[PDB]
Design a protein around this nucleic acid. Structure first.
Length: 88
DNA sequence: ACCGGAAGTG
DNA sequence: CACTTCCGGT
């Protein structure tokens, strides 16, 4: 059709614009910054969505680190599980 | 917890 | 490609 596979940063935003996932992941601090409150839950869902049952935060976080070079994401240093989108 | 290299997947 | 898997560092 024109369908690519579901990107992880698509999937993070999908969750982050839904109040029914605030317990798991939410916006915090500055503009574009977010926090994972339940790292193991996020990964489980990202495993469910990609039919990859052995997914976990170690593997998911690697995925996120590959976004640093690509200028989609980066880390907020000091704050745990706190990344921030590159909207500039 | 967080990093990044390296090989593997489809 | 866009991750997944694995794992040796700080």
């Amino acid at each position: 059709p024109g369908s690519r596979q579901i990107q992880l940063w698509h999937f993070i935003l999908e969750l982050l614009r839904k109040e029914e996932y605030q317990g798991v992941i939410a916006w915090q601090g500055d503009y574009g910054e977010f926090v994972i409150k339940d790292p193991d839950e996020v990964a489980r869902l990202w495993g469910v969505r990609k039919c990859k049952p052995q997914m976990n935060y170690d593997k998911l976080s690697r995925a996120l680190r590959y976004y640093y070079n690509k200028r989609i994401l980066h880390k907020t240093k000091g704050k745990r599980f706190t990344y921030k989108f590159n909207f500039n």
